[PDB]
Structure formats: C-alpha cells, structure tokens
Design a protein around this motif. Structure first.
Motif, mmCIF file in Angstrom:
data_model
loop_
_atom_site.group_PDB
_atom_site.id
_atom_site.type_symbol
_atom_site.label_atom_id
_atom_site.label_comp_id
_atom_site.label_asym_id
_atom_site.label_seq_id
_atom_site.Cartn_x
_atom_site.Cartn_y
_atom_site.Cartn_z
ATOM 1 N N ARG A 162 0.806 -1.213 0.000
ATOM 2 C CA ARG A 162 0.000 0.000 0.000
ATOM 3 C C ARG A 162 0.842 1.267 0.000
ATOM 4 N NH1 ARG A 162 -2.410 -3.026 4.179
ATOM 5 N NH2 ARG A 162 -1.580 -1.494 5.664
ATOM 6 N N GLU A 163 2.066 1.210 0.517
ATOM 7 C CA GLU A 163 2.943 2.370 0.512
ATOM 8 C C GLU A 163 3.427 2.659 -0.903
ATOM 9 O OE1 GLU A 163 6.773 1.687 2.424
ATOM 10 O OE2 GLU A 163 6.295 -0.450 2.582
ATOM 11 N N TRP A 164 3.561 3.948 -1.221
ATOM 12 C CA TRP A 164 3.981 4.339 -2.562
ATOM 13 C C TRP A 164 5.410 3.900 -2.853
ATOM 14 C CZ3 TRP A 164 2.537 5.231 -7.173
ATOM 15 C CH2 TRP A 164 3.369 5.900 -8.079
ATOM 16 N N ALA A 165 6.228 3.742 -1.809
ATOM 17 C CA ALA A 165 7.628 3.382 -2.006
ATOM 18 C C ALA A 165 7.759 2.040 -2.717
ATOM 19 C CB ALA A 165 8.354 3.349 -0.660
ATOM 20 N N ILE A 166 6.946 1.065 -2.321
ATOM 21 C CA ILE A 166 6.958 -0.232 -2.985
ATOM 22 C C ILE A 166 6.026 -0.250 -4.194
ATOM 23 C CG2 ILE A 166 6.681 -2.708 -2.641
ATOM 24 C CD1 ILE A 166 7.312 -2.421 0.207
ATOM 25 N N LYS A 167 4.907 0.474 -4.129
ATOM 26 C CA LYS A 167 3.937 0.448 -5.218
ATOM 27 C C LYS A 167 4.503 1.040 -6.504
ATOM 28 C CE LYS A 167 -0.143 1.486 -3.957
ATOM 29 N NZ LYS A 167 -1.266 2.330 -3.461
ATOM 30 N N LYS A 168 5.403 2.018 -6.398
ATOM 31 C CA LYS A 168 5.915 2.702 -7.579
ATOM 32 C C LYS A 168 6.785 1.811 -8.457
ATOM 33 C CE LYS A 168 9.050 5.769 -7.072
ATOM 34 N NZ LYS A 168 9.696 7.037 -6.634
#
Ligand SMILES: [K+]
Ligand SMILES: [Mg+2]
Ligand SMILES: [Mg+2]
Ligand SMILES: [Mg+2]
Ligand SMILES: [Mg+2]
Ligand SMILES: [Mg+2]
Ligand SMILES: [Mg+2]
Ligand SMILES: [Mg+2]
Lengths: 354, 122, 50, 120, 95, 106, 51, 44
Positions: free
Chosen positions: D48-54
């Motif tokens: 859910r965090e953008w750090a991994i999602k990106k």
RNA sequence: CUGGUGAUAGCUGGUUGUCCAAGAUAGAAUCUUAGUUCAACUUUAAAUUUGCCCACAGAACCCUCUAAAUCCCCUUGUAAAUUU
RNA sequence: CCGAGCAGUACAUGCUAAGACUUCACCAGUCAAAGCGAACACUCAAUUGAUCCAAUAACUUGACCAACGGAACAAGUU
C-alpha cells in the motif's frame, strides 16, 4: 438458578429461522479472519487480554514532535496514478511479471520509504524498545528529520546505525559521523544516552555525548558540552541500548548548568536523565530525529574500566531462583529413593560424633 | 434435599411506610446492633449453630452489641429467626472513661451513662 | 383469585414467609413450595389459598 | 532465557515464540508483518505504501509477494530482528508465492526458526 | 508373631519381613513394587520405569514392620561401600 | 456390571489458586477445559501447569487446527459471522526467569 | 448498613492479627512447670512432733 | 457455568442444521439438458 | 474310665471402690457381612500457624430446555486448625 | 440393559528426572517440565492377576489362580 448476561451474546445476531438461506464460511481462512476480528474487541467477560495484555492508560500519549508536513493529496494522487499506467504500459514489465522474473531495486524503495512512512515506522519500532517509555515517560514523537549515524571502522568500512542494530563497543570506540538534512540558520542539539548502562541507579542513565547549538549539518562546529565516551556494558549484564537524540533549537540556549569537564571520566557526573533535561528545555527545543543501537560486551570494554574509568570491571551473571520442593515429610509414602537427595545439602559422607 | 437458604436481596429493602413504623432513618443508619437470642439452636442445622457461637450469643436473653457492617450483617441474615435485632441508642452519647462504672442498658436500646437508682424529682 | 390476593387483609402470606425463610420454615417445606406458594399440596390444588 | 508462551495445543496457531512472521494478502494488496508475541508490531512491509507500489506492476501477484520479503528482510536487519517463526496453513505453504517469500527472508539474513529456550 | 519364645523366652523375628524390606536407621522402610518382574511385555516404559524403583512405606506400614522385627535389625551398621549408607539419616527435617 | 465407581475427575485447582510447575489443574474425560497459556495436555486430556503462578479461566475464541478434520468440518457449515467460543485455563507467571547479580570485581 | 463493603474492608485487620498473635503466644508457651527444692523438703514435716 | 451470566457462550448446536410444493413456491424441479455433444451439455 | 486337657469355640453368659473430664453413624478388602485389618471418627501428649464463617471473580458443551444448591473464596466475626 | 478377558500401528513402545493426580485404606494405577541420547510418554471407555515357586547364562516368561486381593491340592447325605 440463572443470571442474565451483562451484555450482548456472541452469536445473538444470527437468525435461526432461515438457517438454510444463510451464507456459510465454506473455508478455514474465512472463519479464521472473522475469528481474529472478534478477539481484538473488548468483551464483558474475562479474556486473555485482561490478564496477559499490557495495561495501558486511557489518556492518549501526548505528542511532542514537529508538526506534520502539509501535502496536497489531490495533486499527489494524480501523479501516482499516471506513473503506474506508464509502468503497466510497457509490454516487457507485464511479461517479466508474468514469467515471475521481475524484481525491484532495494536502494530505491528505501529512499522513498524514509521520506513518506519511514518516520512513522520508526516511532512504532522505538515504542517496542521502550525508548519513549524510559526517555519521555510515555510521550511519543514522529522523527520527521531522518538521522544518519555511522561509526568509522578502519578507513574504508562504516557501521550504520538505523534502529537497534547490534554494534560492538570496539566499533564504537570513537565518535561516529553524524549526517542529517537541515537548513542553514537552524540550530540543533545532539544527544547520546545509555539507558541500561547505569550500574547503580536503574532509573538513571549514562551520558555519552552532548553537542549543543550545532549550526546546520556541521557537527564539528557544535559546542562540546560533554566529550564522547564509548559504551561500557558490563560483562554478563545482558544487552544494552544506546539512543541518539537529535534536537532542533529555535533560539540559542545556554547549557552552563549541564556543562561537564573535558574529559569527564566520573560516572557521577556522567549521570543524566533525559526527562529532566528536556523538561526545562522543551520551550525552545524539540526533538526531530532518533537513532539507537544494541551493544554487547567485548574485550574493549575491559580497557574502558581499567584505563579510562580507572576502576575494576564488574562481572554479572544470570541467576535463576532455586527449584521448589514441598515441605519435607517424615514418611514420604510411595516416593522413590531419591526423595532424600532433594533435601540434602552436601554430597560428601557425614559421620556425626563418630 | 434440605440445604442452605439464599435470601433474595429484595427482602432487605425497607419501604417508606416502614421508616415511619419502626422509627428508623435511612439517611442516618444506626451504628451498633443489640442482638439477643430468643430461640434455641437445637433442632436446627449445624451451620446455624456455629454462627450463634461466632456472635457470642450462646446464652439466650443476654444482650450483645455488634457493628452494623455488611460482613456482620451477613452472619445475621442466616440466624435472623433465632435472634432479636435492635439498634443501640445513645441519648447521652458514647460512654466516657468516668462513665464506665455507671452505664446501664435498658430494654428500649438506650445506653444511659448515669444510673443513679433514684426517682425523678420532676 | 387475583382480586382475593390483592384485597387480603392478612399481612402474612405463604409466599412471603417461604421465600424469606421466616422462622426457619423451609426446614419443613419443599423446594417446590417456593414456587407453589401453598396452592398445591401433593396432587391436590386448593383454589381458596392466596 | 525469556520464557515462551507454551500451550494452546488444541488451537491454531501456536504461541511458543518471541517473534512471528504473519503474511496478510488481500484481493488487491499483499502485506507481511513481524510482530512480538504480545501483539506489538516490530516492523511491517506492505504494497500500500507508494515506495513499494511505484516499482510494482501488480501488487497481488507472486512478484509482489517476493518483493515484500526482500524489503522486509532488509528492514528486519536494520531493526535487529534475525529470528522469527512462520506458521502457515498447508495450502499456503504449498503455494508458490509463499515459498519465494520465505526464500527472500532466508536470503535476506533472517532465520525462520527461533533458538530453543535455555531452561538451565 | 511369637511374643515369647519357648526356649529363650524372648520375642522372635518374622523372616518374611527381612527377605522383602530394607530398614533405614532413620526409621524409614524401603520396599520394591509388587509386579516389577511380571508381564513386562504389556506394560508401557513409563509404567515399567516406576516399577523398578525403591519406594518408602507410610506411617502405618512402617510401625507394623517394627513390631515384626527385633532390635538386632534396628542397630546402626557400618558396612564398607554400602549403597544406602547416605540414607540412614534425615537432613533439613523439621517436625 | 455397572458396579464401577467414580473416577474423581474434575477441577483440582480453582480460580486464583497458586500453582507450581507440573501441578495437575484438571482431569477430564473430554475437552471440557482447553489448555491455554503455560498449560500442557497429557495423553488423557489432563491439564498440568507449565509455570508457577496463578490459574485463570477465560472465554476465548476456538480456532481449530487445519489438520483436525472433525473440527474444521464443523466451522465450514457455520453461518457467516458466527464465532465459536470455549473455556480456556491459563497460568499467569508470578516470578521472572532470573536476575542478574554481581559475582566478582575483576 | 452504616458502612459499605469497600469502606469496611481492612478496618479491623490490625486488631484481628494482634488477637491471633496472643493465641500463638499461649500455644507456644506450653512447658512443664518449674520444680522447686522447697517443695521436696516440705515432706519431712509429716513426722514433725512435739519434744 | 450455569449460574454465571456467561452460561451457554460455548453453544454451537443451534447454529447447525439438524419435499412439498406449496401454492406459491415450486417444490422440486429437474432441468434436463439433452444434446449430442457432451461438452456443451456439461458446460451448460 | 484315666491321660493329652486349663482341647478348641468369629458363639452364649458373666466381668467387683469413689468422683470428674472428652466422646456416635464416610468407606474399602475378606471362603467375608455374628468376625477382622485398614481408613474415617474419637482420646491423650507435643510442636507449629493459620483454621472456620466467607465479597466480587471463577467451574461444559450435550439429548432441546429446566430445581434446591455445591466447590472455591479476600473481608469480617471468632479460636480454632494442621503436623508429630 | 449393552459390553470387556482384544487387536492394529511403532521398533528411542530408549535412558533418566522437578512437581502432581489417585476409584474414598493399603496394594496397584495415571500425568509429567527439564536433561542425556535420537529424530526433524502410540491408537483404544474396559481389554486385566499379587506373593511364593518353577524355568533361564542372562534378559525375560509362566494360572477362564473367571470364587477374577487369588488356600499348592478335598464332593454328596443325615
Ligand atoms: K473368594
Ligand atoms: Mg475356653
Ligand atoms: Mg460430659
Ligand atoms: Mg478367598
Ligand atoms: Mg479465607
Ligand atoms: Mg487415595
Ligand atoms: Mg473377591
Ligand atoms: Mg478392587
């Protein structure tokens, strides 16, 4: 005799009339997820959380950190959605993901992690070690300013300290390198304390480093209120934890009362309490960063007590309570022959008057 | 089977008509009791015999003073059919050190501190 | 029967004494007597009892 | 030397551990949790965090599950956690997504079995 | 039990007690478990483990065996390399 | 027959009782009380204390093991939202594992 | 009731404890009486007579 | 325990299940799918 | 008839001065139920420190439901209780 | 009123050792942390029998002793 329930029953809402037209779990995972949800809710009857759960006060913990950054959610979401579409637009990413060969760069993920939710994870992680409980008596704060501290080992290697990682005293014999993002004209104050390093007062803490009025990121220019002292955990005393406190100052502060001689090799002056220190400086000073590590005993600790501290090194040991045995009876009926050995002091023969 | 009796809590809830009937005051409850056994413990269960011994009510028609507290009242709720319960009255107040040798308990529950044995001049 | 129970002039009733264990009367009574309230003895029903 | 919560033999899962790896995969996202026996969460890793999602094409495939373990293992070493227990179901253990997640944790320096308590 | 012998006029000792029980000088009697050599193929190892153990006797049985033996067996012996030498005395016993 | 006597099985240690390691808490024919924290179960479903402390009885959610066929087949037919409960007995440890004491000054 | 359950609790623990300690003192003071030498010599008076 | 207010918390039998056609609902229906191809009959 | 012989008898009957004190109804085995052993209970002496009464809390689901209660048990009232 | 006097799977069904239960006594019976040694306290409501003795190098074995706490071996009739 019967007693009415003090509250709603667990399965009272279920309708017993139309039992055939009720959807079933049909799987173990579905029941397991629902079972855990009800286990996390308070109940009027006795529960496992009542006796084994950690007691907490109804008063929510106060926050003493910096104000949260202001971000426009609507603008953020538009760019985030657009980036994913381009990533999915590539036909190679889909094939790589379908062939189960794709991977993400670890360095890039942590770079964005430290900026968005890194401070939030650190607060939760620091709470587990009881740093907020001991340093601030339960007060919490979000480390909005990331702190990068690394100890110099040799001339090419560095030992980074992120959160509670194991570091030996030999690596921490010299002052580490402190780097953190800051603007010009701001004032900072570094602080390193040993919570468990104290040998006399369990409540008190040992001061190992105190730099005040640091201009920006130039740590060397900061005033040396107390010289750096390597950690000295006693042998057989367990694992200690040392925490780096990074303070942000709004106005210059005078630390004459907290000044210590250089060097300071007396443990009575090294005694330090974070709660009292921040209590009288909370007006113009606010914590911004946080870092800590776990430290054990090694041979370098012996050098600190003998040469630096000029004292004999104490040695501790983990002592267990004696085993329980019932009161000895004159006639141990049906007991084995080894019953008498459990109540005997020495293993050597005795002869009394003979 | 004959067993112990559980008295419902509704029994020991005085109605407004009872306060004007016995002369009590719910706002200012009395401090001490005057328990006097008027019935024999013979032909009664053993647990009721013990409580009479606990309260020091062995000899009948012998007043004994106890404290109006829930634990003491708990024992009285079991042998209430063998004893007579009366509040202690103190018209002159608690006895003093100089009045210990001149006290006297009357049948009305009043503990007088001046027992002169002389007719009233009034 | 309900009217008889309401206007009864006797301040002492079977139900009141039995439940409160007045005079230790439960020593000669039955566990069912706490619910029968004296209206049922053996297999016989007494309508005149209140 | 710290005692473990022995018992709970008639229920699942066990409580005889100090730290446990708990993996939660929903319809759209996959999340892994490292939590103490008392319930407190030490470190977490979610899509859910953008750090991994990106960097993820899909947050619900095997690649997403494998990528969580590599990031989680890195965070565990920084946090100082090296030993944790894993209590999967028979169908989850046989799944290819969980096998790669366990491989990432082992390759990341984390051991999926705690040392036995020292009683004497 | 022969309370008075027909030749010496003194109490005799039942030899059935001596062949089965061992008396410690402290006053305890040590015996075996009835059935530790019978049908061992149908007994669990845990059950067999406590069958081959030397157990004590209670207050009544110990006093019974005292009346069935004479004072010759209540004396203190000093056998060389006696396996039960250390068990003839009580330690840290109160009341 | 039917001349069999009672087995004297039931609760041996009540709520709030102080128990030591190895003490038997309850003997039962079937799982009337389930083992909780620091409570072991023998062959005959006998509950014994694994730690020295205080015995507590609580109502906890019963989650069967996936291998147990009969118990898993029971929860698959339950209406959605229903949760099974059973009585669990726990032992709250009273003493810590050990203490660190000074042994020498070298 | 004059006092409630909470108010009553612990209001007599000191006196109750002290009363039992008096029971222990009498219970553990049981010992044979002292034997005097005057009592033994007084039995010679049974043969006392006039000169 | 029966005297305790939490009596019956462990009950589960009432949550487990132990034809006539009314004038409003059909009782029993059989849907016959006859075809020369086995794949379509099984698929439908 | 004498002797062994004062045979034996879980059976019947009897069992002698004064005064005081404590003192009754769980069981198990037995060619055992007219007996005996053990335990329980009772007695005495000794040691010791808790005993009894009992506030909440706590003790199961079933074959659907359902009684009087009981165990446990801080206070408190009391002086007993365990061990030898 | 219905059963039991077994059977199956193991071959560490190995060795030791805190603390407990116990069929209202005893006898007998039952659970068991840790440790050593290996692997990665078996299912089963009952499914059983003491001492002496006999056999055996030893480990171990031997009773529908079923009147099942069992007398090494004895029925009718007055
Ligand atoms: K027989
Ligand atoms: Mg004769
Ligand atoms: Mg008398
Ligand atoms: Mg016989
Ligand atoms: Mg008590
Ligand atoms: Mg027994
Ligand atoms: Mg027989
Ligand atoms: Mg028998």
């Amino acid at each position: 005799r019967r007693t009415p329930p003090l509250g709603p029953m667990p399965n009272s809402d279920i309708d017993l009339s139309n039992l055939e037209r009720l959807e079933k779990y049909r799987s173990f995972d579905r029941y397991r997820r629902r079972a855990e949800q009800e286990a996390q809710a308070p109940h009027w009857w006795r529960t496992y959380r009542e006796y084994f759960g950690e007691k907490t006060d109804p008063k929510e913990k106060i926050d003493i950190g910096l104000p949260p950054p202001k971000v426009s959610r609507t603008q953020q979401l538009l760019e985030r959605k657009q980036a994913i579409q381009e990533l999915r637009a590539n036909v190679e990413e889909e094939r790589a993901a379908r062939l189960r060969t794709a991977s993400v760069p670890l360095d890039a993920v942590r770079a964005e992690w430290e900026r968005t939710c890194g401070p939030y994870h650190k607060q939760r992680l620091a709470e587990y070690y009881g740093l907020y409980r001991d340093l601030f008596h339960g007060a919490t704060f979000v480390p909005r300013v990331p702190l990068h501290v690394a100890y110099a080992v040799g001339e090419d290697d560095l030992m980074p300290v992120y959160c509670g990682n194991e570091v030996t005293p030999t690596e921490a014999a010299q002052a580490p390198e402190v780097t953190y993002e800051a603007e010009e004209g701001s004032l900072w104050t570094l602080l390193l304390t040993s919570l468990d390093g104290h040998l006399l007062e369990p409540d008190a803490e040992y001061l190992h480093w105190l730099l005040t009025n640091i201009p920006g990121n130039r740590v060397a220019e900061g005033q040396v209120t107390c010289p750096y002292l390597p950690p000295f955990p006693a042998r057989g005393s367990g694992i200690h934890r040392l925490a780096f406190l990074l303070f942000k100052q709004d106005q210059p502060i005078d630390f004459s009362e907290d000044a210590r001689p250089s060097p300071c090799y007396q443990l009575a002056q090294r005694t330090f309490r974070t709660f009292d220190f921040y209590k009288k400086h909370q007006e113009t000073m606010t914590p911004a960063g946080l870092s800590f590590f776990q430290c054990r005993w090694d041979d370098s600790v012996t050098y600190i007590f003998h040469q630096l501290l000029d004292m004999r090194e104490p040695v501790f040991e983990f002592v267990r309570p004696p085993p329980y045995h019932p009161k000895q009876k004159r006639f141990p009926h049906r007991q084995p022959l080894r019953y008498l050995d459990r109540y005997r002091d020495s293993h050597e023969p005795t002869y009394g008057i003979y | 089977k004959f067993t112990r009796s559980r008295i419902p809590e509704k029994v020991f809830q005085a109605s407004p008509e009872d306060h004007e009937k016995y002369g009590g005051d719910p706002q200012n409850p009395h401090k001490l009791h005057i328990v006097t056994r008027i019935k024999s413990t013979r032909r009664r269960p053993y647990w009721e015999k013990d409580i009479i011994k606990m309260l020091g009510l062995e000899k009948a028609h012998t007043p004994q003073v106890h404290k109006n507290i829930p634990s003491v009242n708990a024992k009285l709720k079991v042998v209430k059919h063998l004893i007579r319960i009366k509040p202690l009255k103190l018209p002159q107040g608690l006895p003093a050190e100089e009045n210990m040798s001149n006290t006297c308990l009357k049948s009305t529950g009043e503990l007088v501190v001046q027992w002169h044995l002389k007719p009233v001049e009034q | 029967q309900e009217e008889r129970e309401r206007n009864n002039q006797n301040p002492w009733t079977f139900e009141r004494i039995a439940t409160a264990n007045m005079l230790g009367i439960r020593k000669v009574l039955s566990p069912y007597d706490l619910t029968h309230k004296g209206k049922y003895w053996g297999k016989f029903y007494m309508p005149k009892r209140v | 030397v710290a005692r473990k919560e022995r018992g709970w033999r008639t229920v699942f899962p066990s409580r005889e551990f100090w730290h446990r790896l708990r993996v939660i995969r929903t319809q759209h996202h996959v999340e892994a949790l490292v939590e103490h026996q008392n319930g407190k969460v030490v470190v977490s890793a979610s899509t859910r965090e953008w750090a991994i999602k990106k960097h993820l094409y899909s947050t619900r495939n095997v690649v997403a599950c494998e990528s969580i373990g590599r990031v989680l293992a890195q965070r565990c070493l920084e946090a100082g956690i090296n030993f944790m227990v894993y209590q999967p179901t028979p169908w989850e253990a046989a799944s290819d997504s969980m096998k790669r997640l366990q491989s990432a944790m082992t390759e990341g320096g984390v051991v999926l079995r705690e040392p036995q308590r020292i009683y004497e | 039990l022969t309370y008075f012998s027909a030749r010496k006029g003194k109490r005799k000792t039942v030899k059935a007690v001596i062949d089965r029980f061992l008396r410690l000088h402290c006053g305890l009697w040590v015996r075996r478990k009835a059935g530790y050599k019978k049908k061992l193929w149908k007994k669990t190892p845990a059950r067999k483990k406590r069958l081959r153990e030397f157990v004590f006797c209670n207050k009544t049985q110990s006093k019974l065996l005292d009346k069935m033996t004479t004072s010759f067996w209540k004396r203190r012996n000093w056998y060389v390399d006696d396996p039960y030498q250390k068990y003839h005395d009580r330690t840290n016993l109160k009341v | 027959g039917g001349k069999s006597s009672g087995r004297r099985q039931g609760i041996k240690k009540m709520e709030g009782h102080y128990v030591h390691a190895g003490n038997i808490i309850a003997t039962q024919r079937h799982f009337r009380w389930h083992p909780g924290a620091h409570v072991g179960v023998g062959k005959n479903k006998c509950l014994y204390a694994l730690e020295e402390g205080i015995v507590r009885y609580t109502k906890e959610v019963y989650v069967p093991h996936p291998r147990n066929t009969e118990a898993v087949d029971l929860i698959t037919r339950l209406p959605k939202g229903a949760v099974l409960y059973k009585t669990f007995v726990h032992v709250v440890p009273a003493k810590p594992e050990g203490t660190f004491k000074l042994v020498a000054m070298l | 009731p004059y006092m409630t359950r909470e108010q009553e609790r612990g209001h007599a623990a000191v006196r109750r404890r002290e009363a039992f300690e008096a029971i222990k003192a009498a219970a553990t003071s049981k010992f044979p009486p002292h034997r005097f030498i005057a009592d033994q010599l007084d039995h010679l008076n049974v043969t006392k007579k006039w000169s | 325990y029966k005297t305790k207010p939490t009596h019956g918390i462990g009950k589960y039998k009432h949550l487990i299940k132990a034809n006539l056609g009314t004038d409003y609902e059909y009782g029993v229906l059989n849907i016959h799918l006859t075809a020369y191809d086995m794949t379509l009959a099984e698929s439908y």
